[PDB]
Design an enzyme around this catalytic site. Sequence first.
Site, mmCIF file in Angstrom:
data_model
loop_
_atom_site.group_PDB
_atom_site.id
_atom_site.type_symbol
_atom_site.label_atom_id
_atom_site.label_comp_id
_atom_site.label_asym_id
_atom_site.label_seq_id
_atom_site.Cartn_x
_atom_site.Cartn_y
_atom_site.Cartn_z
ATOM 1 N N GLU A 71 22.605 16.558 33.120
ATOM 2 C CA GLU A 71 21.922 15.260 33.336
ATOM 3 C C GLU A 71 20.801 15.116 32.315
ATOM 4 O O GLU A 71 20.394 16.103 31.715
ATOM 5 C CB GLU A 71 21.380 15.267 34.759
ATOM 6 N N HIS A 100 18.491 6.853 41.274
ATOM 7 C CA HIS A 100 18.140 8.230 41.606
ATOM 8 C C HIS A 100 19.246 8.988 42.300
ATOM 9 O O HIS A 100 19.157 9.586 43.377
ATOM 10 C CB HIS A 100 16.928 8.106 42.590
#
EC number: 3.1.27.-
Length: 108
Positions: A71, A100
């Site tokens: 990520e 998120h």
Amino acid sequence: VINTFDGVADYLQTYHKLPDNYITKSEAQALGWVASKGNLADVAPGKSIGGDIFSNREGKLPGKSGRTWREADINYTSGFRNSDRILYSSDWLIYKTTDHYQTFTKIR
């Protein structure tokens, strides 16, 4: 500074690594990043968090034997981290989240 979804997605797929402005959670922590102070841009000017392995425990991203996910923060410049992340696999699938890690959509 390459930190947009298109810029980083195009960099990963061509260079197969993040651009120079990315540092891991651990590297930022060692430099003095304290998440609850929102001081990343003070202790590591121009850098964003990225390169860390993403567990995908929840199975939201497509799984495959030999496939690992990493990520990187997107759209970050200063203050607390935001909710935007690019998710990229070892076989170069690229997803985005802007909520998120709640939901992801493919971008490459």
